[PDB]
Amino acid sequence: RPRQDPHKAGLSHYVKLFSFYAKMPMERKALEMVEKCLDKYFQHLCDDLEVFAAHAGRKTVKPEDLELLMRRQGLVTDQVSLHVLVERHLPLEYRQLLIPCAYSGNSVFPAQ
Amino acid sequence: MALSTIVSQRKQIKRKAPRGFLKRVFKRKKPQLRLEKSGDLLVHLNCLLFVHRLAEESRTNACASKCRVINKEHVLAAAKVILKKSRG
Amino acid sequence: KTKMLNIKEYKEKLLSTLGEFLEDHFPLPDVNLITLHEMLEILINRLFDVPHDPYVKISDSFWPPYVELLLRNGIALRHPEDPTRIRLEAFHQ
Amino acid sequence: ASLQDDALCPYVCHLLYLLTKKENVKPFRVRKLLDLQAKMGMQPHLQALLSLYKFFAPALISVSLPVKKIYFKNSENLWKTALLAVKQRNRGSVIPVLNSSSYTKECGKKEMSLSDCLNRSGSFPLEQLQSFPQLLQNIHCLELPSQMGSVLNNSLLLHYINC
Amino acid sequence: SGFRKELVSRLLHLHFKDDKTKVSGDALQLMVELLKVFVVEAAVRGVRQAQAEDALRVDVDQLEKVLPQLLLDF
Amino acid sequence: MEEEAETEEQQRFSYQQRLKAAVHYTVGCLCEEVALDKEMQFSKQTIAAISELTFRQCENFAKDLEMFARHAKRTTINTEDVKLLARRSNSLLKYITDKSEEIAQINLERKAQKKKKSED
Amino acid sequence: RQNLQMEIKITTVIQHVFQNLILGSKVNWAEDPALKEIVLQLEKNVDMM
Amino acid sequence: QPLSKSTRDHLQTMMESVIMTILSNSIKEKEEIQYHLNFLKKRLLQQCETLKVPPKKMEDLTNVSSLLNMERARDKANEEGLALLQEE
After folding, report:
1. Which residue of H20, H24, H31 is in closest CB contact with F14?
2. Residue C93 to residue D32, Cβ atoms within 8 A
3. How does DSSP assign C12-79, residue by residue?
4. Which C-chain residues 9-28 have CB contacts (< 8 A) with chain A?
5. Which of D1, D95, E45, F116 allows an S-S link to E66, with CB 3.0 to 4.6 Å?
6. What are phi and psi of D130, to 5 degrees?
7. Domains with residue ranges and CATH for chain F
């Protein structure tokens, strides 16, 4: 008779992925405070997205706002673009929606 | 294996992202906004690189103290450096 | 020679059909941009002429949507360290 | 190519298990499978496919697998009940293990032999020999085991070493 | 006791990627104390570390310990 | 050409030390202004260490303002762009925006004086 | 013989490049009989020829 | 024999430091003064490289002071210990 908090369902995905990268046995008490770290990151992440959108004069959040954030984070540099990072870390089905490629009569999707 | 300590995951779960979860969490915190249809995926990418950073820093602290099991004081120390670095 | 005659005959038919296919499904795109067929010839030659170093530097002639097409299907690979340079996959090994 | 998409990966692995022959294993396809293993880890359906690739080309891959559990889940397919109707219609170690000849044969070779270049004759692979009529045709040319003590409990090879 | 207005503008124009970039006077004015706060803040941190170490004077070694934390904060 | 280029490189190199000397002159004054109330003495190497640290920090500031301005399609940097850079520290953000408000008040006072001149 | 070593390698590369282009173009090759028989020949080895 | 590379390393470094200090306090006449100082510096580097000295071993100039202080501390401790032993 299981009952699961929907909020904990989302965090459980990244918590398991954490144990894959660690490559060390990890104590149970370390698990839940990583969950504590994640929600703090999400809260502060959303706050930053407000200002960058607000500065541009549009309330809607567009991808180039996310590019601007990651450049300040140091993830995106002159050599490593946004397209390069998607290729390395995301599956094929997610790649089609994000990165545009021309095919079948020079048709490009998404339009860029 | 004891309940208290969890062994490293040999096989990663399917790389499918929880798109529904990201939309609601972004919705409740800032209801007034609307996010573009593909913006959820990029947020998922941003979260991966954060967790990847957190795992590397925690491992170094555990090895520095000559500990074979990652402990809570190791990861909290990792959190302080990464969280400030993660904000830009 | 007979083995050579069949092999050379087969290659000419293969190459001729490939050229027709590119013209019908990937016309010339609408600094000048070279066509996809011209891009393929550059990568293939560099693989054979310089076996040790087949990397080619990306230029403004390669307009990115074509570059993504080759990279996605597995025909081309980025350099592991410098993402500016791409090579061709060594199919024959 | 469907191995790229995660949704179809377990099922395509099962299909590729049956179709695989010696000509299909090529070095560039070998690199693709290793790359997929880094991203997803120790997937059971990939471990089965990699072992089949090692058997055909031991000079390219080296895998040691722990011990035999069923790698592909034998879930009851939707047509299993119907197959019963179709089947009714159709109805109505001290000794070494057997392994192909040691792969140090050829090994460092400057170029292919002239006989091989002309596609002349060859030898009969050990894995194909599984029935007496197959032995009858190819008795004169055969591939011997890596270790000769494995002939002891194989009846078809005893007929060869009889004469 | 503060950076010159001309001095700050010289540093910024040195590192601009595009020459089309210009700095407004009020913004250039506000940049002046921003650098001053950075210099002042660095000195205070060194004093805090020295007092904890109880050193008679601030040295290079105490400065390096608090150096990386300041950059993350800024 | 090559001899000219190295001189321009030397001129670029020489232009650095003039900025370095001016920065070091300013930093040294501030360090002494920190000494008296903290009653603590600073080693001469420490002021040199701060001078290098402050010089390398201007590079990060210079690029961000250009990057922020390009985001808003503005070729000229304004006060709003600078406020973005200070958000990493909440305490510093509150302090810096107060001076911006103070500068705005002074600018309003300057505008009021200009109106008085027009009336006269 | 050295000519054999080079013509075989070139033909192998063209075979696999042409195969992936057809896949990525997202076209129905089976509909066209002329293109259909080319597809079947791509996998076959040139050594057996 | 020529003296060690360390001597020129240290003297070069201290001359850039002192040149920076003297240019800090000067206002006008920048280019000519810095060109003359650089010429003098490079010519002194050439002269000291050409110079000949009997062989010897020298420790780095930066750390002489602290090591000297610990040497005095050891001096005092060993002196008092020897005096006490002799008295006994």
Report:
1. H31
2. no
3. HHHHHHHHHHHHHHSPPP------HHHHHHHHHHHHHH-SS---EE--TTS-HHHHHHHHHHTSEEE-
4. 25-27
5. E45
6. -135, -5
7. 10-105 (1.10.20.10)
Q: How far apart, in whole angstroms, are the C-alpha atoms of residue G16 and residue G8?
A: 13
Domains by residue range for chain B, with CATH: 19-86 (1.10.20.10)
One domain, residues E28 and E2: yes
Among E37, H19, H64, smallest CA distance to F48 is for H19
- Give CA–CA dist G44/H3, Å, rounded: 74
Query: Quick check: do E and F touch, 3+ CB pairs under 8 A?
Result: yes
Q: Which domain holds residue E45?
A: 33-74
The experimental method is: cryo-EM
Residues E38 and E72 in one domain: yes
3-state secondary structure of A48: helix
Looking at the fold, whether E17 and E28 belong to one and the same domain comes out as yes
Binary contact (A103, G27; C-beta < 8 A): no
Substitution target from E5, E10, E12 for chain F, most F beta carbons within 10 A? E12
Contact F25 H17 (CB under 8 A): no
Residues E41 and E67 in one domain: yes
Cβ pairs A/D, distance under 8 A = 9
Residue C82 sits at the chain A interface (C-beta within 8 Å): yes
Chains B and D touch (3+ CB pairs under 8 A): yes
Both E72 and E38 in one domain: the answer is: yes
Examine the domain organization and report whether E13 and E44 are in the same domain.
no
